């Protein structure tokens, strides 16, 4: 269940960060991330998860 929820919530966190990079202001705080009923509640740990997984992914890209 956690793996499924984490997949969804890193997905939505990626959406928020992609919005931020384009320039528009996004809060990027775990409390105000939109819950999708597939995501569940946002802890503080998934911000760290998203950052680490994104950095590893950027390294993995060819």
């Amino acid at each position: 269940d956690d793996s499924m929820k984490s997949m969804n919530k890193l997905d939505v966190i990626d959406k928020q960060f992609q919005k931020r990079i384009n320039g528009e202001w996004v809060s990027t705080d775990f409390k105000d991330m939109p819950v999708n009923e597939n995501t569940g509640e946002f802890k503080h740990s998934d911000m760290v998860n998203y950052a680490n997984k994104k950095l590893a992914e950027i390294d993995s890209m060819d």
């Binding site: 997905d11 990626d14 992609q18 990079i21």
Partner: peptide
Amino acid sequence: FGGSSDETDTEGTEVSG
């Protein structure tokens, strides 16, 4: 030489989904 290198494009972040 013969080839002319293409001048840089600003890098942006994209994801399929």
